From Swiss-Prot, chain A:
Lineage: Eukaryota, Metazoa, Chordata, Craniata, Vertebrata
Compartment annotation: Endoplasmic reticulum membrane; Cell membrane; Nucleus; Cytoplasm
GO CC term, one of those recorded: cytosol
Protein role: Participates in the biosynthesis of phosphatidylinositol 4,5-bisphosphate. Preferentially utilizes GTP, rather than ATP, for PI(5)P phosphorylation and its activity reflects changes in direct proportion to the physiological GTP concentration. Its GTP-sensing activity is critical for metabolic adaptation. PIP4Ks negatively regulate insulin signaling through a catalytic-independent mechanism. They interact with PIP5Ks and suppress PIP5K-mediated PtdIns(4,5)P2 synthesis and insulin-dependent conversion to PtdIns(3,4,5)P3.
Residue ranges constituting the PIPK domain according to the UniProt record: 6-302
Protein's name according to its UniProt entry: Phosphatidylinositol 5-phosphate 4-kinase type-2 beta
Originating species: Homo sapiens
Pfam families hit by this protein: PIP5K
Keywords in alphabetical order: Acetylation, ATP-binding, Cell membrane, Cytoplasm, Endoplasmic reticulum, GTP-binding, Kinase, Lipid metabolism, Membrane, Nucleotide-binding, Nucleus, Phosphoprotein, Transferase, Ubl conjugation
Curated annotation (Swiss-Prot), chain B:
Lineage, uppermost ranks: Eukaryota, Metazoa, Chordata, Craniata, Vertebrata
UniProt-annotated location(s): Endoplasmic reticulum membrane; Cell membrane; Nucleus; Cytoplasm
Biological source species: Homo sapiens (Human)
Membrane topology: Peripheral membrane protein
Keywords, sorted A to Z: Acetylation, ATP-binding, Cell membrane, Cytoplasm, Endoplasmic reticulum, GTP-binding, Kinase, Lipid metabolism, Membrane, Nucleotide-binding, Nucleus, Phosphoprotein, Transferase, Ubl conjugation
InterPro entries in the record: PInositol-4-P-4/5-kinase_C_sf, PInositol-4-P-4/5-kinase_core, PInositol-4-P-5-kinase_N, PInositol-4/5-P-5/4-kinase
Name of the featured protein: Phosphatidylinositol 5-phosphate 4-kinase type-2 beta
Intrachain disulfide bonds: none
Length: 303, 320
């Protein structure tokens, strides 16, 4: 029994919406291939409830899902089952209405702009074709579904993505990399440091050669693909989990690589014992040069 | 796993809508009591699926359910579980817009007018109450759900009810009985049907008589009188006793032939499922099963009190 209960009506609508569409899809055959129309398709559902089921849900709302066949295929290629995705959004309210995570920390939910949604349609075909070609092995943001909510006459656009960080292992310091950190921001529980703060601290990321080489083999293909699309101004979200600080149950630095898809252990010969998280964020809203600077500045953080 | 496949889009939307609303209801706690608003309540969902999921369903349609908290409770009082109900309607298309049976013959779906849907609201509080105090034991139609569908901008109203007939047993002869000082009979056009709808003077002419024995005749007649008085107060009339007759030996032979053609219980029913069914006594000529219920209590010189007594006198004579 799912009461779509959450801080605000908008989150309840989202939970209702993801639940309803994922169920609807369970009645849609998986096709042998995506067709051009799947990329201009949508589901729209309008709800008008009078004196019914309004304990958590507004009585009136709209929910629109863009290209459900495409995003369901994306979910599959990213190794995510529809029931788990549904459960993570729907079992319990997402937590902190501009940037959320599901209650299990597996997925992130980003409110975006109209033009952002237009940009996603513009790249969706190639993005898909690339996700296929690279067999789901990529540092790119992982687009899991995309939605428009209408509550109280107001439209809100959202994109669901795989959390870059672990959904268990606590992150102890985050670097946004392409410039330094604000003052009011350095006084947060977890500050968002930048390129300089990183090079200042002289931070280092030691990870088995394979991790570095393999990590860069892919980092390159991805960036090369973002340039091929004339995109830029995207950062590399980096998380650091320091094992000792957080130190029947789970173990230290223990994690399930099939879930925490972006996690990398320290080297057999490394200073502190750490788990690192890394992926590309914010690709929605020279650029060929952007890629090469990005690609080099990053390569110079891995030994 | 459900395609909502059907011969007409209206049926697909029906299957979709019952499926959808029963699932929503599953996430809605079952309340301690019903409230007055529950009798004024409704759900309305409008769908627009562009270039998506259009193999069986239309791209655009509307589904409205009246008073769903109430109908859920009615299903429960009638001993119908919501999942079974949903499955009977959705597992495979209903059969035969403007009168359908579910594929398993448990439920019936009647297309009704908007005047009918209004009468349902008018009488809904009393009807529910009446269902509570007779414990679900009635010959009356058992209303399980009420719906408005919109396809191609056209509105269609539907009521879902329990089948008067067995979902298993075959009916070999059937009657619609009101009983009046008028003329009621099977037209030369009806008799030409496989299962004709015979009426009052047919039943009298052929001198039929149903043999259920006293213990059942009494239980039955106590229901009728109460049911018909309730209808009486509500100022209702023009309803019939739907009578079906199953011949046990004739079905046993029918089954045998069904096997021979293909290859090349015995008059037993679950009174909890086949709710209107009565075995014949041990002193009956032919061995039979009967099905009897009141139908048509909404719009399709005598008065309503007269009718109740008259209708009741006739049915009383039918048994023995
Ligand atoms: N199938 C599509 N193809 C291209 N652009 C779209 C599509 N759907 C929505 N958009 C754009 O995304 C933004 C939001 O559109 P809407 O879903 O009407 O709110 C607008 O800029 C639309 O033009
Ligand atoms: N994929 C992601 N997983 C987890 N957290 C994220 C992700 N993308 C952005 N964030 C965080 O959410 C905040 C808003 O993102 P942005 O607006 O892109 O800076 C940032 O401070 C990030 O730390
Ligand atoms: N809550 C209600 N109480 C009484 N009559 C109603 C109610 N809802 C609908 N009706 C009647 O049912 C018919 C069709 O209703 P609708 O198309 O749902 O607005 C019309 O005669 C309405 O006035
Ligand atoms: N609840 C019911 N169960 C089975 N058959 C019914 C039921 N109601 C009506 N019928 C039959 O369906 C047809 C239409 O009924 P009506 O609309 O009352 O004339 C007639 O053949 C009736 O005998």
């Amino acid at each position: 029994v799912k009461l779509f209960r959450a801080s605000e009506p908008i989150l309840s609508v989202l939970m209702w919406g993801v639940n309803h569409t994922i169920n609807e899809l369970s009645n849609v055959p998986v096709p042998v291939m995506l067709m051009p129309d799947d990329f201009k398709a949508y589901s729209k559902i309008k709800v008008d409830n009078h004196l019914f089921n309004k304990e958590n849900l507004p009585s009136r709302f709209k929910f629109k899902e863009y290209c459900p066949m495409v995003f369901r295929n994306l979910r599959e290629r990213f190794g995510i089952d529809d029931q788990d995705y549904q459960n993570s959004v729907t079992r319990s309210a997402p937590i902190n209405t501009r940037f959320l995570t599901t209650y299990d920390r597996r997925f992130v939910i980003k409110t975006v702009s109209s033009e952002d949604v237009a940009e996603m349609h513009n790249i969706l075909k190639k993005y898909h074709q690339f996700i296929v070609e690279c067999h789901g092995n990529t540092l790119l943001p992982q687009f899991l579904g995309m939605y428009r909510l209408t509550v109280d006459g107001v439209e809100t656009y959202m994109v669901v993505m795989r959390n870059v960080f672990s959904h268990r292992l606590t992150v102890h310091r985050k670097y946004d990399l392409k410039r330094e950190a604000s003052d009011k921001e350095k006084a947060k529980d977890l500050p968002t440091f930048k390129d300089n703060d990183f090079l200042n601290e002289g931070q280092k990321l030691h990870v088995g050669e394979e991790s570095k080489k393999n990590f860069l083999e892919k980092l390159k293909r991805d960036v090369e693909f973002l340039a091929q699309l004339k995109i830029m101004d995207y950062s590399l979200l980096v998380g650091i989990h320091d094992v000792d600080r957080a130190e029947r149950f789970f173990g230290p630095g223990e994690f399930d690589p099939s879930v925490d898809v972006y996690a990398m252990k320290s080297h057999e010969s490394s200073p502190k014992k750490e788990v690192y998280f890394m992926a590309i964020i914010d690709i929605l809203t020279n650029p060929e040069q952007y890629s090469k600077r990005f690609n080099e500045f990053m390569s110079n953080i891995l030994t």
